[PDB]
Design a protein around this ligand. Sequence first.
Ligand SMILES: NC(=O)C1=CN([C@@H]2O[C@H](COP(=O)(O)OP(=O)(O)OC[C@H]3O[C@@H](n4cnc5c(N)ncnc54)[C@H](OP(=O)(O)O)[C@@H]3O)[C@@H](O)[C@H]2O)C=CC1
Ligand SMILES: C[C@@H]1O[C@@H](OC[C@H]2O[C@@H](Oc3c(-c4ccc(O)c(O)c4)oc4cc(O)cc(O)c4c3=O)[C@H](O)[C@@H](O)[C@@H]2O)[C@H](O)[C@H](O)[C@H]1O
Length: 319
Amino acid sequence: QQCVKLNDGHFMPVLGFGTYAPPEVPRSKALEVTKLAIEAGFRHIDSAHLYNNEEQVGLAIRSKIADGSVKREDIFYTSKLWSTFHRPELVRPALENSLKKAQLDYVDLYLIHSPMSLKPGEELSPTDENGKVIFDIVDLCTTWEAMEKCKDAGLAKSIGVSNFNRRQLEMILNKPGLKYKPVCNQVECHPYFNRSKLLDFCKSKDIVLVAYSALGSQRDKRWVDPNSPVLLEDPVLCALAKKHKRTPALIALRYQLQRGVVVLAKSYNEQRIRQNVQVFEFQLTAEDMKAIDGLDRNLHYFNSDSFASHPNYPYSDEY
Ligand SMILES: NC(=O)C1=CN([C@@H]2O[C@H](COP(=O)(O)OP(=O)(O)OC[C@H]3O[C@@H](n4cnc5c(N)ncnc54)[C@H](OP(=O)(O)O)[C@@H]3O)[C@@H](O)[C@H]2O)C=CC1
Ligand SMILES: C[C@@H]1O[C@@H](OC[C@H]2O[C@@H](Oc3c(-c4ccc(O)c(O)c4)oc4cc(O)cc(O)c4c3=O)[C@H](O)[C@@H](O)[C@@H]2O)[C@H](O)[C@H](O)[C@H]1O
């Protein structure tokens, strides 16, 4: 499918498959749907250590390779370094563990999952005696130096960041002796939070903005306010769907593609997985795009209020 050339020289498919499913979903499902996604045409697959599914996603990939559906070089697999492994010496070992889990020799993209460092350890969510998550203080530039070492070691073809604001990205870009710029910044991006300012900045530095929750999130009552507006039920998106004879999801996805944003799309439903690849079958008019541009309400679906006190909380800046 369509790809975008990274400041790396490497290529990333502009459409990616989101693999996160809540803990209640059996892990066998991740294996099943990833195969369905590859069969549908998805070549870009987004995972992470935190998802507790890299083994299943890797198994699916190995399966589609074995049956001759695809070759490893045809698949773009990404993993993410969790915040409890920000200390430089824990980076490569974290990547190696993901590689071992997924039964892969390398990941096409490794990202620092979030700039908000947490206390080092196996536990992904460390909390103190009063039930509060334990933060850690780490110079992300040293974490980045460790990431660069992983790319030089061939373990990651490309390296990037996730959930970084302009200031945090600049910290890396301005780091003395910088070897590799992040190829991307994966952030929450959709019509209710389009990130136009950050997008423009990223474009100026040749960094790709990858959109997550591009379809409005999974809206789990544990992290998403039920009163928050349902994206796929937006009057404007629905109007454009009926006009183009597509669906609101396809409209939201096409919007990103036309503004130069790589879009992720999660679905554990075979029919919807197959529908999502149809985003390349139609185009939105310039007027359609302006209409969607006006939907922005700076709405972040995930309730990150508990991290508001973190020195690296990214949402303090205007962008
Ligand atoms: N780095 C980071 O901080 C983060 C990264 N991510 C990554 O990006 C992805 C972002 O997606 P996420 O927030 O999970 O969810 P999305 O916003 O992609 O979810 C869309 C939701 O809509 C449904 N859906 C999918 N296709 C359609 C369709 N055609 N029509 C109607 N409904 C549809 C899905 O449900 P159903 O399964 O029932 O189809 C899915 O739950 C994740 O899976 C993950 O890989 C996500 C959050 C944070
Ligand atoms: C600051 C926050 O950091 C990240 O969430 C951090 C939280 O993730 C939670 O991990 C979860 C994630 C998640 C997180 C990151 C991802 O990349 C991702 O794809 C998914 O997604 C869910 C989606 C659901 O529908 C239901 C859920 O219970 C969870 C969930 O617990 C952990 O359980 C918490 O302990 C942790 O603090 C995300 O980037 C989020 O969008 C951002 O706002």
